[PDB]
Ligand binder design. Structure first.
Ligand SMILES: *[C@@H]1O[C@H](CO)[C@@H](O[C@@H]2O[C@H](CO)[C@@H](O[C@@H]3O[C@H](CO)[C@@H](O)[C@H](O)[C@@H]3O)[C@H](O)[C@H]2NC(C)=O)[C@H](O)[C@H]1NC(C)=O
Ligand SMILES: *[C@@H]1O[C@H](CO)[C@@H](O[C@@H]2O[C@H](CO)[C@@H](O[C@@H]3O[C@H](CO)[C@@H](O)[C@H](O)[C@@H]3O)[C@H](O)[C@H]2NC(C)=O)[C@H](O)[C@H]1NC(C)=O
Ligand code: NAG
Ligand code: NAG
Ligand code: NAG
Ligand code: NAG
Ligand code: NAG
Ligand code: NAG
Ligand code: DCD
Ligand code: DCD
Ligand code: CU
Ligand code: CU
Lengths: 333, 337
């Protein structure tokens, strides 16, 4: 019943789960999957999973579609290539490195390939419960030492539909194809409407500065425009420390939310649990209707944030802030 | 008084300085430099600095050589391109992303260019005190909020006294493809070996260099960046050390080495206990400094942590772990103790 758990709970409650906790681990070939937030733990709001894997010369999965789930690919570290296509639109591919993001709405064909030896892919899937597929195809892993990974169609019920006619394009240059795309060389926009895949390289997407509680920079990844009926938001939030004269705000939202620290040290105080400090890869989950406070102990922290509903923490900070063109906040309060 | 400090001390002593602490910050144009370890703070053993900067369409510094300093470029986050050339050898260039490493021995022409918006370059220079150059080039920055960087002839002689020798004829090559040039190079697509020849620059992509597994105090994986082979008389080692937790049945070892050493956490949560100071837990980018001859203990509270480690001398912690370990081909440690 303590706040920190080794596997996500089997019912909705506040919790924190450390990076590389057991988290119902399974392996699929050389890949190791951890389920930090599950359907049961989030009341089916979303799934937050981590995949660690070594370099592979082959695709990590055969090309496929999910008709009822929206997947979000975030590169925690290392690098992996992601391919995506909607309808008959041109097929897109990007090589994601640390902090890069790839959006895969429902009905978008996709696959990936792990490039670097110490690669970690954080997946946020909406709605929650998609992890059953990985329990099913996976082999349970005890992983006593908590090592990141181990050194070395008919799945319609799980919402997986094969796309055997898809051929991942092979004309990648400087991490992107086709050639007329912007990747780490300029600004990236979110898709103009729902249904289309899109990618945002670390620090190149739109940002908003909120100065109500110290400085926080929200970099939206998914908004109402893209989520539509899937009804969620996703972004990174970067944070300064909170000045001594500023009260750390208490929040209570209609929907569940969660974050995974990427950089820095973030303290979270949820419900009646102790204020707890989270470091890299650690995850905090807050049920809808539960009060919480968070602040950065580090001088700069950045977290990956997901929320069920259209008016979660990220959107609130955006609406209370202003457009902003830097990954850094002002030097003066 | 307090193990944690906001600026590197003006003398040798155990300390920890948190990521983005003031650290006697200066700005050089859009770049913000923090001096986590200085000549005075390390007894002149080495300098460890952090440079945070936005994308630039221009070189971050005019091409130059240092005759008496060995520089080490480590990419904490973001990305920057680095060019390097030893004498008449082929000019090399790589685009470094998170966890990538570039080695620049004495007498090697080099320059860099910041590519990504949130870029952080950790520089380790031997011997220490090299930072005086940046005190001169730079303008003091108060940076009250500790933001990573601030949003939006005559010199010839001066620069030489700082061990900076301009190479005006050097033209950084412009035929980069997939983050590397020339074509016959290995970058994120295969193993990188440390240079077998002293004086030659070399690069190691994250996780692609040689590694060693030490199983004496839990699992630790050392990934050497600089060894005696390369350092020679500069007399130091540089590597990353990855760590598992320490099993309850294993005693966390107490270490002491003649030379000063230091580390900056890259990933995870690492507890350090130095001398008679209280144990302190370090996170992303935090730096711990241990004077030579001072006893210290460290362990990882995270299930996996990785630190960038530098040591003065030929047989510091990283070399010790290697000597007590075995060749290893994975960035992960075994699943069983
Ligand atoms: C830059 O790096 C990219 C990878 O990000 C390299 O792309 C790779 O290019 C090779 C050679 O063209 C492709 O392999 C070839 O694919 C064709 C088509 O299937 C096949 O007929 C050949 O037998 C060979 O296997 C490879 O698929 C492609 N990889 C990706 C992910 O696109 C690119 O070549 C690099 N450029 C340079 C100049 O180094
Ligand atoms: C892949 O990305 C690389 C950068 O990593 C691109 O290399 C860049 O290529 C351009 C044009 O060839 C170079 O600019 C040119 O430089 C010359 C010489 O100074 C000048 O005469 C031209 O006016 C122009 O400015 C650029 O310097 C070079 N960058 C680097 C760092 O090498 C490459 O073009 C990309 N390849 C593809 C297919 O996208
Ligand atoms: C996805 O495709 C299926 C089958 O064509 C279709 O029934 C469904 O409406 C699509 N869903 C969305 C959200 O477009
Ligand atoms: C999977 O679970 C079974 C049943 O409890 C166990 O015996 C086996 O060792 C597990 N496999 C792994 C790889 O952890
Ligand atoms: C969106 O999610 C919020 C928060 O969970 C929920 O209260 C609301 O009913 C949802 N809206 C729709 C139309 O489902
Ligand atoms: C570097 O070059 C200088 C000037 O040519 C030379 O005097 C010195 O011996 C060289 N140093 C090293 C370590 O090679
Ligand atoms: C810059 O800071 C240094 C170190 O504290 C100080 O010695 C120097 O005088 C400062 N420069 C100015 C102009 O104040
Ligand atoms: C190398 O450094 C160590 C530790 O500071 C020192 O004890 C040793 O004498 C040095 N060796 C040389 C050749 O300077
Ligand atoms: C394994 C990556 N993934 C989960 C985000 C899919 S291919 S759906
Ligand atoms: C600022 C980068 N640098 C220090 C490592 C040199 S060009 S010497
Ligand atoms: Cu999928
Ligand atoms: Cu230099």
């Amino acid at each position: 019943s303590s706040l920190i758990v080794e596997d996500a709970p089997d019912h909705v409650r506040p919790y924190v789960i450390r990076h590389y906790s057991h988290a119902r681990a399974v392996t699929v070939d050389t890949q190791l999957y951890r389920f930090y937030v599950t359907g049961p733990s989030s009341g089916y709001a979303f799934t937050l999973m981590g995949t660690n894997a070594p370099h592979s010369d082959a695709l990590g999965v055969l090309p496929h579609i999910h008709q009822k789930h929206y997947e979000n690919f975030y590169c925690n570290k290392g690098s992996f290539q992601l391919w995506a296509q909607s309808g008959n639109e041109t097929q897109q591919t990007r090589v994601l490195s640390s902090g890069d993001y790839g959006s895969v709405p429902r009905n978008v064909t996709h696959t990936f390939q792990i490039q670097d030896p110490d690669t970690e892919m954080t997946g946020v899937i909406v709605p929650g419960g998609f992890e059953d597929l990985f329990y099913y195809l996976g082999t349970n892993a005890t992983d006593t030492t908590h090592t990141p990974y181990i050194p070395s169609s008919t799945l319609q019920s799980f919402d997986v539909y094969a796309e055997l006619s898809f051929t991942p394009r092979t004309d990648t240059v400087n991490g992107t194809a086709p050639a007329n795309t912007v990747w780490h060389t300029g600004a990236n926009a979110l898709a103009s409407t729902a249904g289309d895949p899109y990618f945002i390289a670390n620090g190149w997407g739109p940002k908003y500065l909120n100065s109500q509680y110290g400085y926080q920079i929200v970099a939206p990844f998914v908004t109402a425009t893209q989520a539509q009926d899937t009804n969620y938001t996703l972004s990174t939030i970067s944070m300064s420390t909170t000045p001594s004269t500023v009260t750390v705000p208490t929040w209570s939202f209609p929907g569940a939310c969660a974050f995974q620290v990427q950089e820095g040290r973030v303290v979270v105080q949820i419900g009646d649990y102790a204020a707890t400090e989270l470091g890299s890869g650690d995850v905090a989950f807050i049920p809808g209707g539960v009060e919480f406070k968070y602040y950065s102990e580090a001088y700069f922290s950045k977290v990956l944030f997901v929320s069920s509903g259209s008016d979660g923490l990220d959107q609130n900070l955006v609406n209370g802030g202003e457009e902003w063109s830097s990954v850094s906040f002002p030097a003066d309060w």
